[PDB]
Amino acid sequence: NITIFTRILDGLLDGYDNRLRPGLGERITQVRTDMYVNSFGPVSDTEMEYTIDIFFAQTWKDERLRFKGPMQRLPLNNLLASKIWTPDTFFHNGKKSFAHWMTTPNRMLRIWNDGRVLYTLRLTISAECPMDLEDFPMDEQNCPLKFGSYAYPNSEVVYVWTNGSTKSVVVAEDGSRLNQYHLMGQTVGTENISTSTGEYTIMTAHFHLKRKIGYFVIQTYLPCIMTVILSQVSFWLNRESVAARTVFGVTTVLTMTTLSISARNSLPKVAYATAMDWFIAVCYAFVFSALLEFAFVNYITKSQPARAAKIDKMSRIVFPILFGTFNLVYWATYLN
Template sequence: MLKSKRVIKFFVCWWLAVCVCFVVSFAFEGKAQEGGKTEVISQVPKVENVGGKNRQNEKASRSEERVNKGGEKDEDLTTLPPNGGKPVEVSVGVHITNFAAIDEAKENYEVVGYLKAAWKDAHLAFDAKNERQKYRFHDLEKVWHPFLEFVNKAGENNVDNALIVADPDGMVSFSEGFNIKLSSDFDFKRFPFDRQKLKIAIESFRYDETEVVFIAKPKNSGLSKDNFVSLSEWKIENFTQKVVNNKLVTEENPVSRFVGELDIVRNYQFYVGKVFIPMFLIVVISGACFWIDIEYFEALTAIGLTNLLTAIAFSLSIAGSLPKVSYLTFIDGFITISYVFIFLTIIEIVWAHYFSQKGDKEVAESSHRKGRWAFPAGFILGNLFLGLFLFMPS
């Protein structure tokens, strides 16, 4: 009876040690992710630094040009619109027509849509009655515009069309069709039950906030309702927008920045049916070994080893469908816990057989019976701890 208690304590200690190891590892992993997390729209310093230098140089040259020309009246249409010394207010919006692709390994995505902006320019006002025109079309290079660019772009921006239209009162509307890859900050710790916020960051390449200030207008932004907008694996929930001030190292004044956030949720049904259920069944088969008498040692050993090799082969076959990240995701933790408990089943079978061969059959049978409830309880608790640490709010 004493030996039986020692064996039970041994296995309880092992299972507790495994659970504690997973809890500690994921706790430190979460802290590391929180500590190292940076906003993605500041991941392109080279582009911003070059833009900052250009803004400073061009701002100085524009001031000198005004002095030489003797004021704003003699300036051409490409100069800043007169606004009484205040910065020009530019409303910015993004209308998404297609969420084309997402690359989880490179942490970027491809999106198609329209970039829209509007501002007031007295230079372009005209008399609609005399000229018999409701609006005027202008060449982009011949009139002033805020030089909008995507800060977090990960590839070349393919511009389909660009248009500038001025109303009689000088209200200017700008529209540009784009097809671009953008980088974003992905967090796959909860994969495949994760949701992502894909960011679209837009700044003026040429002007800081003393000259241009962005204004977010919801009516200028939105999502197309066409069926082809979403990807099969992702569902678009919402698109929000805001304007923030971004302070660059190379500039004295911050830059106005438009930030659009595309909220997407992964459709997890594929992974439940193709990964979780098959792996769970393999674990259940291993747990069934505790219901077979320890006398059938060869059969129990064969079942345990076969399950372990099957689990390894299965995980290798699905590796291409998992995100290639340096930290553990929920699905990685689930597969690892399955490995551990399949392996512990084999250890328990060998341990019970050892006691049986020594003639202490009572201890062997007792530990084997305890595994009937200890195995599923430990497996469930291990995954509960995993889920708690990954799904609890930061």
């Protein structure tokens, strides 16, 4: 009762050429793609890439595989995958894609009487995600995933998402777990590209990432915030205490300087200014300006002590308000 299955498989491969796509010279082969994200791996900002584990699935029609038997489906494994024609799908932005072979090559092959074929494949893709860090860290990144045929133009093989966008891409609840990103949602798109070798259909899946703030708050913003507050303490010290107020300005300015370098060490070496950089510069100005106020006051503490005292007392109030006022504009500007 099992030998029946074996005979059918031999018949299907009898006179079957895997080098020829189904329906060659008769029509255009249609392929349906559905993606299930097993886990959305970490996003390496420095390398401008991300890791993803998916169960990539394809469906298409092959008349040569039509069969009649008691069983309407033929679940199988990688053993028969190489014996028949499969599309030469590849990822344009996939820099290094390697499948999993342990314990067994994770491949599923199913066939129905009508000749429909289902070929689900597991993959891990280190695809690149270019990002415009103009509003970093309050940025919404759109990491795409582009794949298509390598040798079959749009006139021979066509890729189309199955059903709607919701069913086309499925993300596991526990899979979408990142340390510094929120997976807001997913979208799909298709387009044609003309090249030297002809037109090729392209399937693009976009993942909307909303960076979660709070790590940099504990890392960069707070030290800058407290650093500015530390410098303003010098305004409460006597003018004649030249040495004491000198340390406050010198130490704070250097403290801000090292934070600027340290903060960008983890950040990618992008040749443009981010929102964080502007925030650092403002904090640098406050501490730097505070030092100037002391130096200017100390310079005129002899000729006109009266005005010098007014500046010191006035300074204690002006700077905290300006720093507080700036923050509301800053955070409100980006958090909206």
